[PDB]
Amino acid sequence: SQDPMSNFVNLDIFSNYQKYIDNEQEVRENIRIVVREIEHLSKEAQIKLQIIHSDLSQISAACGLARKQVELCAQKYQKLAELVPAGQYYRYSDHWTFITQRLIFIIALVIYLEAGFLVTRETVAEMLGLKISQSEGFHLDVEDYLLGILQLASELSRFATNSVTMGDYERPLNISHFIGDLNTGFRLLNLKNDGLRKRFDALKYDVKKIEEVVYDVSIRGLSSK
Amino acid sequence: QLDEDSPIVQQFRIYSNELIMKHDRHERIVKLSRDITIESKRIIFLLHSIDSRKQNKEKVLEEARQRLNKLIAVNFRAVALELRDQDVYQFRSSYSPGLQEFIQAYTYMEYLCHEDAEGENETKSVSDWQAIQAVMQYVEESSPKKFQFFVDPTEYILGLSDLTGELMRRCINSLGSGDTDTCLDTCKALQHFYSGYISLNCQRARELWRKITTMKQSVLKAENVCYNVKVRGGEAAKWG
Secondary structure, three states: OOOOOHHHHHHHHHHHHHHHHHHHHHHHHHHHHHHHHHHHHHHHHHHHHHHHOOHHHHHHHHHHHHHHHHHHHHHHHHHHHOOOOOOOOOHHHHHHHHHHHHHHHHHHHHHHHHHHEEEHHHHHHHHHOOOOOOOOOOOOEEEEHHHHHHHHHHHHHHHHHHHHOOOOOOOHHHHHHHHHHHHHHHHOOOOOOHHHHHHHHOOOHHHHHHHHHHHHHHOOOOOOO | OOOOOOHHHHHHHHHHHHHHHHHHHHHHHHHHHHHHHHHHHHHHHHHHHOOOOHHHHHHHHHHHHHHHHHHHHHHHHHHHHHOOOOOOOOOOHHHHHHHHHHHHHHHHHHHHHHOOOOOHHOOOOOOOOHHHHHHOOOEEEOOEEEEEEOOOOHHHHHHHHHHHHHHHHHHHHHHHOOOOOHHHHHHHHHHHHHHHHHOOOOOOOOHHHHHHHHHHHHHHHHHHHHHHHHHHHHHHHHHO
């Protein structure tokens, strides 16, 4: 009556929104606590695996140590799942995508080093206690899996070089075949201009670095078979 | 060496199918959102034509309400149908522009109803996210199942902030046409919206903060119009 504009611009709308956002910030804060616990476990696995670059005889010990850290992650993911209501996974998922890509990288690196093959998205989900399908519960996004395994190539090109320095002249060829198959898989995906395609586009430089190492040893007939 | 029977080729064909389905769904929603955005901008252009000229007001609001209702019943229903068993946040970037432009047009039409109120329409609140969500309720054809278009409060707050650029534009157009009482109305509305927005205490809300910054400049522009009207008269305020 004194002020018709106060009817139209209803300040309850702004106070409701403040409440909504406060509630959401509280959830984000709880999520961040759990994600930092995950980051701490993944760093520990990562530090142990740095040994592959200076001592080839420590690889299986490092692998075992990392699997122990990975086991502890799955328990944290259950806590995360408890904080995230159904239908709201992608409301909050920016909080754990980076660390999840990192754990996938670590798992894939361990499996390559133990057995020589590429871990599946399903095996990675099982090891983290994650569903493969969002309808089943808190899930592993296939894009996070794909981004994680792309991190392999940079680590493996570093490892190819160090392996030769340390007298293991067969490793680069093995890596070359493994990264070659990964590359074949990625080209199968026929990715279009997006974030995944941008990161795929960097894989070629690691492919090139590895091919150069293979060339250097083969042109010299170097062997430690 | 790798052929169609290779386990890694099999696996990547499974991943590819999942990415294709996702991409296809995104593309369908982007197209829906584009057409919502285009029609909403057209409706806002139509709404801007309202003036003292009598036989335009109700007729214009009528046509705007019909066109906004069609967007709800056709286009938004298509988007809600696409997202039926989906996490709505996953695709937010696909429909966000359309939703925000629609909310801007919808609330501008409500503003314009309030502005020319002779009696009890002065008592109405702008529609909030729950009121808009209530208009976006759907039923499968043939018991038949209910579905809706979820209206995220953040998307609503962002869409509503764009209304203030429309108020400022109406304030400028009214100066031009000599309808100076409308300059005052739009300025009061801007001042009230601005006070409401600065009440907000949002952490890391970068998009929101930029909207409020822009809003302050709209408020200042409208206040300067009302000022030049007061000091120079309607006519001399037009010339500057």
